[PDB]
């Protein structure tokens, strides 16, 4: 805290509580007693533990009918209206589409849509699987995931 | 018909003004004006103007016959105090409070 190290007043005789710094935390405009520093909150997740958690999540999705395994998922042009039409036809509103070859048109068409996220099979994350209501997976992606997780 | 007049920020401590106010509480406006006229206090001057203003308000705005008006409610609220510094001996300072007051006089037939 900006200020000087001058003792505000003498130690004895004034009748006031002893002071030593205008920057004391007991004082208005003083420093924070245990001021914060930039922190890193990253935790270590064992590779096995991470992969094991993924397998548990994938399993629940199957048991709860939250994994729509389709052979092919694509759009003719990078147009939002197209994907919106397709998703209503499939009857899925909130869905995480995992594809083997993240299609560029599919990436663009779903960009604006907020309840739809298109990721490759190598970009799946645990929270996204649990967050989105449905997890559409292309035939390619399912094999890739099984092989990656093995 | 309760017409009210108020002298806000009136320079004078509430304690002092309250002395005069207690005199005219519940007294006919006429009797009040006389009591204020012959009360040797600065607050009497302050109160009289507020009392006169209230009477004038009742007549001009509420068309109330002055003969019937009486001091239904009179009270003095403490106002904002002006903080001042009074030097003392040996370099010591003693803050001075310039206490103001809010004088509210209410007049009504009933």
């Amino acid at each position: 805290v900006t200020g000087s190290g001058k003792k505000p007043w003498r130690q004895k005789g004034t009748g006031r509580a002893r002071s030593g710094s205008i920057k004391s935390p007991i004082w208005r405009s003083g420093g924070v007693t245990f001021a914060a520093r930039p922190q890193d909150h990253s935790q270590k997740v064992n590779k096995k533990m991470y992969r094991g958690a993924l397998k548990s999540i994938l399993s629940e999705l199957v048991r709860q009918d939250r994994l729509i395994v389709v052979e092919k998922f694509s759009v003719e042009a990078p147009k939002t209206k197209l994907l919106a039409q397709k998703l209503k036809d499939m009857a899925l509103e909130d869905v995480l589409i995992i594809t083997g070859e993240l299609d560029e048109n599919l990436f663009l068409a779903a960009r604006n849509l907020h309840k739809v996220d298109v990721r490759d099979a190598t970009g799946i994350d645990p929270v996204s699987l649990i967050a989105f209501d449905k997890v559409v997976m292309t035939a390619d992606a399912v094999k890739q995931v099984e092989e990656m997780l093995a | 018909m309760e017409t009210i007049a108020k002298h806000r920020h009136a320079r004078s401590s509430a304690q002092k003004v309250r002395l005069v106010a207690d005199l005219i509480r519940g007294k006919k406006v006429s009797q009040a004006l006389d009591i204020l006229t012959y009360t040797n206090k600065k607050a009497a001057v302050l109160v009289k103007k507020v009392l006169e203003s209230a009477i004038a308000n009742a007549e001009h705005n509420d068309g109330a016959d002055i003969d019937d008006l009486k001091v239904t409610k009179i009270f003095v609220d403490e106002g904002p105090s002006m903080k001042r510094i009074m030097p003392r001996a040996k370099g010591r300072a003693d803050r001075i409070l310039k206490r103001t007051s809010h004088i509210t006089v209410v007049v009504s037939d009933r």
């Binding site: 505000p8 007043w9 003498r10 005789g13 004034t14 009748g15 006031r16 | 040996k90 370099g91 010591r92």
Partner: peptide, 19 residues
């Protein structure tokens, strides 16, 4: 809140010395 205290000023009486 309280203001900054004054430095030693002249004192009216000697402190009694107890001894």
């Amino acid at each position: 809140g309280k203001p900054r205290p004054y430095s030693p000023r002249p004192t009216s009486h000697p402190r009694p010395i107890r001894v």
